[PDB]
Assembly symmetry: C3
Homo-oligomer: 455 residues x 3
Amino acid sequence: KLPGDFGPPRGEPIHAVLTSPPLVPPPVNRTYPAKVIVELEVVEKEMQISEGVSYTFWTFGGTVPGSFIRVRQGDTVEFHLKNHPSSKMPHNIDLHGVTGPGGGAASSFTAPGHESQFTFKALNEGIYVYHCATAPVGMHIANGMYGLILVEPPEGLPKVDHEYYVMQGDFYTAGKYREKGLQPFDMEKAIDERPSYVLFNGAEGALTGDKALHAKVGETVRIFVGNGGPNLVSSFHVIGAIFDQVRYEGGTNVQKNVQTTLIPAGGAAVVKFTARVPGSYVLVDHSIFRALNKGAMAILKIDGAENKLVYSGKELDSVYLGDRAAPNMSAVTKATQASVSGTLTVQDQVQAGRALFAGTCSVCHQGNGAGLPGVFPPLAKSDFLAADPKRAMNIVLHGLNGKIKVNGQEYDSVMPPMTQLNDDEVANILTYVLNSWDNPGGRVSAEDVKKVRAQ
Amino acid sequence: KLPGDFGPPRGEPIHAVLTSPPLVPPPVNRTYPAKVIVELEVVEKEMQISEGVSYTFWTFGGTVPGSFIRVRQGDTVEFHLKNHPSSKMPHNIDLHGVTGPGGGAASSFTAPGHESQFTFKALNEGIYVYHCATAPVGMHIANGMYGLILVEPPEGLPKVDHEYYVMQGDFYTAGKYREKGLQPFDMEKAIDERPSYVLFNGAEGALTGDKALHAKVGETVRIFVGNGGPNLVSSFHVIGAIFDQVRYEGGTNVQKNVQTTLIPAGGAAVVKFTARVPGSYVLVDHSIFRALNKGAMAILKIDGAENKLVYSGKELDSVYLGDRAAPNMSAVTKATQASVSGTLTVQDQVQAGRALFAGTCSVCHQGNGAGLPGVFPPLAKSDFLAADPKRAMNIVLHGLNGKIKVNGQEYDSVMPPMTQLNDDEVANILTYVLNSWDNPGGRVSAEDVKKVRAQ
Amino acid sequence: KLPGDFGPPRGEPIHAVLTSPPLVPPPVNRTYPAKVIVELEVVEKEMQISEGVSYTFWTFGGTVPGSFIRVRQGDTVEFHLKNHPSSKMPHNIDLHGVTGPGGGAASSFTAPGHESQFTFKALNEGIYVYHCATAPVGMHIANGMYGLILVEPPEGLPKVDHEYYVMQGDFYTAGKYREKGLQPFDMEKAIDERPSYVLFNGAEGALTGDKALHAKVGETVRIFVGNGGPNLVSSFHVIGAIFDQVRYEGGTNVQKNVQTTLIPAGGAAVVKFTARVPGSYVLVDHSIFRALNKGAMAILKIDGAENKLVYSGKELDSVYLGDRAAPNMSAVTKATQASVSGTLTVQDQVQAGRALFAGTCSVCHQGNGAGLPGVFPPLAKSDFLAADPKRAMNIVLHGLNGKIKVNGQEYDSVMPPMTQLNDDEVANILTYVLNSWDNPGGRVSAEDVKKVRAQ
Ligand code: HEC
Ligand code: HEC
Ligand code: HEC
Ligand SMILES: [Cu+2]
Ligand SMILES: [Cu+2]
Ligand SMILES: [Cu+2]
Ligand SMILES: [Cu+2]
Ligand SMILES: [Cu+2]
Ligand SMILES: [Cu+2]
């Protein structure tokens, strides 16, 4: 006998309601198998992968990850794939959990402006990745063509207060991390498995700040977690909390009470969290340069009463979360746009630099530029800064060590280099500093920084 | 008490029958512990890692992976390692599952033309990797020195219809992927964990096309899956199906009903599959550039009746499987040989290009070169192609965008670059196209392409 | 109800006794929850990451990994973090297993010369990584800022004969592997996840030779195994043995009878081993270039009677363990120091070369330089060596093939290149050989080798 042997579809055909990340459709809440009609449209379009950094994404339903599909084990699914007329490429779909060659791929080839359909029975309960399967497949996946399909057990999943949808992917731009402009896909970096960005839900900051996930003390949260890849394996982890349960795909095994899991490329898991104390809980790939240098962090923000018996301490800040502590970094987007338009003002630079200074500089120099006397020199009203702005560009790019005198006090420490900052970032940060804290004003341009970097 | 405490060996000494991949020895079918004599011979030899690409493999038993060994928990194994006189290197063996230092390594050092032996008790049921343990060990492993040993539980494994043997490895050539000739091992790429090929069973296409694994609807298939490494972890996955069971090494835990697993470097697992519907099921490393750009795909082809209640769709084709949809790519081997011999004909190039066109070009241009009107321009009877063959070389290497006119119709789309194709591949593909579909004939040489690439 | 609900702290406040790797504090042996005061001091200091290779480590408690902390589920922990006045950087802590934002990070920011404190309840039994959480976090972790905290179940762990503490990390030096001197951290290699060293307990040889872990036949050994990362996932494996049990973090799942596991970056596990037969058992990352080319090997040496019914063979030697078979390689440290001081003698070079020859050359040429007649040519009393020392430098760096005559006999084989050896290593090895086995003496300098490498 096949699994999912619940008899022929009954009732009326159901038109599936799909959701955009990070939301999930309601529980199916049904005791009979149905014919479920799923309609999903591929759209190719430019979106911001980071502030001021555009990328041509290929999407299922206009989002990365693609629209979430929710059905019941034993359902017959009539799957309709449309390819928007604006597309340049053909596309198709492989749904994990489908019983049949290619997971649908050979019956879903869809040229721009066309539609395809195929039917399958959902024999297999579980959470499953779906993705494009059009050669070169890795390119399609790298461009954002992946999402999740949930096939519920017949009795449904246990009730929880919130359900969310989070999916990791690795991305490959020609430019370096945070280099502005429209960035092409880079096949060389992709083949080498050397991503420039590693993200949740298709962009830096997609689930941070004002886009965080929410719940309250005492509530339960289920997260459907995918890893679209194409290539990386996630050391998936929640900072400051624990997973009550982790279940992969439709596996019989359920791990309980773990904080760090491994999610294969192409894999998916359901995790459960119980909110205990208020604050920001960070979902990361704990291959930690991905999380804190390439974009792979997402926030579940918990509202409610502190419990000093459990945790006496404070909410996170920029020391850990960096420039993603703040609600957003829209000033960076704005300054980048103004540069393109040729209208970049001092204040545009100042506000972009303010956003970028958080974490990146404030960890040592403080949010108010005061430093710490004799340990971290001040940027506020800094004689040393004012004396030589070009030296300050060199200090950001190349670091500084040795004895110096700042505002009458000696420092004898080490500031690490920061050459990974792009020329616009250095320029905007230094313009912010120059225009703060009784510093002399003026500006540093990206071209100024380019020249210092080349010397 | 030690595990495997089934008493002294009884009956007669048994000379183990080893098998070459992808086959497995018969179940031991025995109720008593035995002395089992295993004889394995190391052979160093050139073989084709891909069509027209030779590599000096170091092998246990003449194959990659090496010969499969099958014993029973509680057996006493007298292990004989011979090193063929033609060898240049010394070799030895570490069998996982052996209780003792190095898994046998210090008692199996075997110079060319010599033999070694050691005895161990198989205390540990499970599936286990064995490999060479001769410094530099990673070099030996990278050259193909790994295989599997099964230590059965005393009652035997449950009966299945088929048992197969599949083992992943990462490979490191001086040349790039599909660059022809005898390719040296590349220690720099190996240390960096940057393989040029990632393969099942020692070659591209080892388990595809006419070398696929077979079964029928309703049958059960057990696959002994190794990962020899040296360095990669497999996101091991079956496209279009599910694993009924996954069990690692001799672990007590058995996962059921998963599609994607993680197999450590040096690890092994037993998976079980039940054939439900006909077609090609693809075993892959779902770090998907490995599977679809570096060689890591294998096929289990299922014969039998369609079941439209389960899956309404079609068998896979080149869109997903690429140039491995076809039975083989022997024409590539032949053309490469003819180049070396200085006898390369137009028809040699045409047939090699035909093989390579599948997937790589046909996904957009179609198998018959017709394209799709106003979306994908034709290669069949293409005025644009005929007008400028050197432009066509540039288009393959560097891509094309912008408005063009082909056979009277305007196109305004994007063909991605394909610089990863080697000069011979570009040459042979374009010669195929030129000699098909009422195109003007002639040929493109590898040297022609080399010149365009250098400009 | 929260987990760990064992009531308010009782008894007296307990000042935790922390241990340095590879030792563990005693079992808590307590039936009531307590207030436990933990004091941990950050120290930045130069230490040898390899012989003659210095590195500026940032440490919790003066070691890498940091001091081991051991508490009981249900305890209230008052955590005190001090930052030594000699520090240049601020530091903080995130303990996995803490319930609260950042695992403590926002309440533990500690400038040089300062102290911080926070209190948390240990709700979660298990083994957990702790690490610094100061931007740039990956830099802090890469510099050595990680360790383990055990939160015992209320009844305690089962009694074992030995408990040890082992933690993997990936390291990123500007220089290549074994390049001498004080090596800076390399942010470029870190972002790319391309470590120069992969180590247990902060140094090459930290747990090999005279620093091996010990036990006796019949005894049980528990190892608390961390993976600090920052970036790599360990294919953690024991050569020649099996793990009775593997349990991750505080998971409910326990795997039994496996040899190879996967430990996520930031993850931790408890493994159990039962000693069966004498000899050296090697803990490795089985992404095997890490273990055998980058430093990731540790030894558990078992004393006691051989059991020929289980294993007839020998203890490991340099063929497998290489230059870590010997008790230590202190001669390398000494020679490097003498080079810096300008006092390097012939004998300093000889003893350093002796240490390095083991495995790296002896696998083919033998420990006594005799080779094997007509298969591996001799280095002992070698006419070919004596005839041209510069040719011998070229042979080490670039390999040798083709027919040669050595001491009257023809060889027609292949010696692989060894360009990864540094100039001092080549120099010291060849000086050893020249001063052994009736060879002519003299010396090769690092500058001699530099010149040959550049030609
Ligand atoms: C801690 C790790 C630091 C971070 C992050 C940044 N800076 Fe820094 N900076 C640091 C130190 C210890 C020193 C003194 C070095 C010494 O030789 O003793 C400095 C110095 C500067 C200066 C010059 C002195 C002054 O005006 O106070 C400048 C202009 C400066 N730092 C700027 C700066 C900016 C803009 C940063 C973010 C991009 C930044 N620093 C980060 C320590 C640390
Ligand atoms: C879809 C992703 C494509 C694949 C794969 C290949 N080609 Fe292509 N090709 C594609 C498009 C959209 C276009 C037109 C671009 C535009 O500016 O509108 C082309 C064009 C060509 C041409 C020139 C026009 C013609 O003769 O039809 C040639 C000669 C060509 N393509 C060849 C070709 C070959 C040999 C391929 C496999 C190596 C190949 N293309 C792949 C789209 C796609
Ligand atoms: C086995 C894989 C080898 C290792 C490791 C090393 N050497 Fe070697 N060496 C090897 C062979 C097969 C040959 C002969 C090559 C041929 O063309 O037939 C050699 C040769 C040399 C020589 C020259 C001949 C002689 O004097 O015997 C030298 C000086 C030499 N090898 C040195 C040497 C050193 C110092 C090594 C460690 C750094 C080393 N070899 C490793 C095989 C192998
Ligand atoms: Cu697509
Ligand atoms: Cu897939
Ligand atoms: Cu070998
Ligand atoms: Cu091994
Ligand atoms: Cu720190
Ligand atoms: Cu952490």
